[PDB]
């Protein structure tokens, strides 16, 4: 049951800035690692760490990165000055034995997105679509469709909540979101999700259905000079009650 | 120094056996690792192969090793939809650093027992004028193609498993800003089956 | 000199080969301040404490089933492998010796004299040195310095014979080594 | 028929000295230069027929360094009993005037693996042509070392080999001269 944990899930940073990626490797593990995977690229090694010292490093490492072991829990990777190319999934790993003959336990990953200007960041617009009456009679089932639109970058964690509790059965979300303007390079994204329940379940008006979308944007320390609202890390939701008809 | 895996993506039908290769250096071998990496989850180790020719089994997943030739074969006997993940292989030399391959993205197409294809219209919970089109209950053989127009948005087929009543459904969502868009002409761009039901 | 106290940790991995890779025995040895604390023996199959100090280590290392199964297979993955890597230049190494015969001190005939046969710069250390008076071997009055390891993949030995040389006598040193098919012979006339 | 390959490693404190080497029947196959992080083959021929990843050794030394701290604390800071060496000076082949030869200094049966070795031609230290082996293993867990001096034998010239070790109060000086 022990796991390598990483916070946050996603991260946005302006080009040139210093980024500290936090990791909590398994308590009794002797070797700690850092790996990264650029979109449409292999998972590449960055650094291995044993007994308060770097064991192995990359040619790219040292010039661009540094590692620190402060407390007997945390292990961190530092990006000196962020480049547009540093946008990747950052994996923190750790292995039990000092002989390396054992498996490496991987963290969930931290999707880092480096942008030239934070002016292109937008939170999602969540909306829930009620099932069709034609579906209720034909299949004897009811499909609820959620829609998260106009968000940039792809820093979205969709979740379905039935009666105040998170659900996984009959739930499916798109693995990749679609671009709203496929011609543009810095185009905003759109993502859809489905929740199928029994016709009698949706027909009960006591039953509550909510689609939660966690967005990873800006922080209160980041400078915002634009007219529009600050696109900060926020939760945008949309709800619907059961309809008897 | 260099590890390759082929293919980058692989689609296989539910219940069908599947295999994928991993090519690694033929010299200085210490260990070969296999990781199962699911979407939004952490890559988890399946096998850590250290002995040449030694076969390892973890459920329906078998792995063989040939250190002399520099290859490794992973086999999924009677593949289930839960096996849909990216399978990565890594080569470990004298150190602790792993040299990863491209990884074979496995997508297990579900067996749709009794398919009932249809296109339904969904009303927004807050607005009556806002709607969404849903192409659902079509078998795994039917594919959903992208929209020709920039104002109409169509998502790819997504498999939902209603764990309770033991049911699997394929679904696709479509919406447009321009009101001159209807369900009957929404999914017309794709090869829609003849049995597809349309309401009113 | 340097009065400061020293603390030494020594690690040894012994690969014992009997008739090539036919019979192999691995011996993982942990040594603290010249005293062996704990060891892994492939014949035993698990870590065993030599002294009291090694007791917590034999316990902990035997608890790790990964490391334990890794170590049991090491006779093939590590021992047998490393043998094959070196075999051509290590096992099959053959260096021909330079044989020289000279008296200890120039002494007249019918008087006591010591003859010296110097066998040098050869590999491996297995060498057969025999002394001959006039076709027949002289087993008595022979003194050897023993086999000397030079440290540069060469060996050397000096074999002496106590003699009372006479007019007709033609002494000869016979050297048998795997580098040569036929025995090496260097003769000295009285 | 009977051969032995030994992967011999050590770490020593407070000196912070570590060595890794492979031994085939008493002869060093190769060693790892910790400072240069490179494999050093005893005979240049070996580097042409075999390879070695220096990292494997560097990883092992890191563990040895940690293991030493653990054992130092466990023994309640009990230090190593000094064992003085047995120095022996000899030649590569029989000595012959104006014919190039090699003087060999064999420092043997000692612990810890720290020694100050000086070749002395006519009382003055010599460095030209000098080569040396690493700390070689012994069945009794002591150390072996070899020091080499290429030279041309002369009746006028005299050689010595000064060897300093904490096991001995006064440095061992082994003389050599033509007779």
């Amino acid at each position: 049951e022990p796991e390598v944990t990483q916070t946050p899930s996603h991260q946005v940073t302006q080009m040139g800035q210093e980024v500290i990626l936090r990791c909590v490797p398994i308590s009794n593990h002797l070797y700690f690692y850092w790996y990264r995977q650029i979109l449409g690229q292999k998972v590449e090694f960055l650094v291995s760490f044993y007994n308060n010292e770097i064991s192995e490093k990359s040619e790219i490492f040292d010039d661009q990165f540094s590692v620190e072991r402060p407390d007997g829990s945390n292990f961190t990777l530092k990006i000196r000055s962020t480049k547009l190319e540093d946008s990747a999934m950052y994996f923190c790993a750790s292995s039990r034995l000092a002989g390396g003959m054992d498996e490496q336990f991987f963290g969930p990953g931290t999707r880092l997105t480096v942008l030239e200007d934070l002016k292109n960041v937008f939170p999602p617009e969540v909306a829930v679509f009620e099932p069709s009456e034609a579906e209720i009679s034909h299949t004897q089932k009811a499909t609820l469709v959620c829609l998260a639109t106009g968000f940039y970058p792809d820093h979205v964690e969709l979740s379905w909540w039935v009666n105040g509790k998170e659900v996984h059965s009959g739930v499916c979300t798109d693995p990749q979101p679609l671009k709203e303007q496929p011609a543009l390079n810095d185009s905003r994204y759109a993502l859809s999700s489905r929740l199928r329940v029994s016709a009698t379940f949706w027909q009960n008006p006591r039953n509550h259905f909510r689609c939660q979308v966690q967005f990873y944007g800006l922080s209160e320390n980041d400078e915002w000079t634009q007219d529009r609202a600050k696109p900060v890390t926020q939760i945008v939701s949309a709800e619907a009650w059961g309809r008897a008809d | 120094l260099n590890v390759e895996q082929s293919p980058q993506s692989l689609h296989v039908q539910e219940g069908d056996s599947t295999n994928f290769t991993c090519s690694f250096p033929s010299s200085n071998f210490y260990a070969l690792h296999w990781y199962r990496w699911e979407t939004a989850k952490s890559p988890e180790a399946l096998f850590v192969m250290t002995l040449n020719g030694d076969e390892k089994k973890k459920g329906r997943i078998s792995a063989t090793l040939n250190t002399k030739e520099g290859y490794s074969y992973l086999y999924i006997k009677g593949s289930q939809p839960e096996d849909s993940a990216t399978y990565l292989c890594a080569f470990k030399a004298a150190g602790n650093k792993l040299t990863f391959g491209g990884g074979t993205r496995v997508l297990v197409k579900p067996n749709i027992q009794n398919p009932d294809p249809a296109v339904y219209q969904l009303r927004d919970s807050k607005s009556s004028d806002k709607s969404v089109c849903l192409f659902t209950d079509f078998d795994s053989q039917t594919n959903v193609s992208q929209s020709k127009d920039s104002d109409v948005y169509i998502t790819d087929k997504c498999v939902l498993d209603m764990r309770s009543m033991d049911f699997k459904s394929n679904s696709a969502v479509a919406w447009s800003n321009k009101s001159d868009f209807a369900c009957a002409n929404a999914f017309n761009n794709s090869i829609i089956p003849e049995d597809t039901f349309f309401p009113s | 000199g340097d009065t400061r106290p020293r603390f030494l940790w020594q690690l040894k991995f012994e690969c014992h080969f009997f008739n090539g890779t036919e019979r192999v025995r691995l011996l993982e040895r942990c040594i603290y301040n010249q005293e062996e604390s704990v060891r892994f023996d492939s014949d035993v199959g698990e870590y065993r404490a030599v002294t009291e100090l090694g007791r917590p280590d034999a316990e902990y290392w035997n608890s790790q089933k990964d490391l334990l199964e890794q170590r049991r297979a090491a006779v093939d993955t590590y021992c047998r492998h490393n043998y094959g890597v070196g075999e051509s230049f290590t096992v099959q190494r053959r260096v021909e010796p330079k044989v020289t015969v000279y008296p200890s001190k120039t002494q007249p005939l019918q008087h006591h004299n010591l003859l010296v046969c110097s066998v040098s710069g050869f590999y491996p250390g297995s060498i057969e040195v025999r002394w001959f008076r006039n076709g027949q071997e002289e087993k008595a009055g022979v003194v050897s310095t023993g086999l000397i390891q030079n440290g540069d993949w060469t060996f050397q030995t000096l074999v002496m014979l106590e003699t009372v040389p006479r007019s007709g006598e033609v002494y000869t040193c016979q050297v048998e080594h795997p580098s040569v098919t036929s025995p090496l012979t260097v003769e000295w006339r009285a | 028929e009977e051969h032995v390959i030994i992967q011999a490693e050590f770490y020593l404190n407070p000196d912070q000295s570590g060595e890794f080497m492979f031994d085939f029947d008493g002869d060093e196959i190769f060693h790892v230069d910790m400072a240069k992080k490179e494999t050093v083959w005893r005979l240049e021929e070996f580097g042409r027929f075999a390879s070695f990843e220096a990292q494997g050794a560097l990883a092992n030394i890191a563990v040895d360094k940690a293991n030493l701290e653990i054992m130092t604390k466990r023994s309640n800071y009990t230090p190593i009993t000094n064992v003085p060496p047995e120095v022996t000076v000899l030649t590569n082949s029989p000595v012959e005037l104006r014919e190039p030869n090699v003087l060999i200094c064999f420092i043997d049966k000692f612990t810890p693996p720290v020694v100050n070795v000086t070749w002395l031609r006519n009382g003055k230290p010599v460095t030209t042509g000098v080569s040396e082996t690493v700390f070689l293993p012994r069945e009794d867990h002591l150390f072996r070392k070899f020091h080499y001096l290429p030279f041309l034998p002369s009746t006028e010239d005299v050689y010595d080999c000064r060897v300093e070790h904490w096991g001995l109060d006064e440095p061992l000086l082994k003389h050599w001269e033509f007779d």
């Binding site: - | 010299s27 004298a94 | 902990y60 890597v85 | 196959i29």
Partner: peptide, 13 residues
């Protein structure tokens, strides 16, 4: 062909 290192393991603490 490469010479292999039998990897050292850390002692009990």
């Amino acid at each position: 062909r490469f010479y292999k290192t039998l990897r050292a393991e850390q002692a009990s603490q």
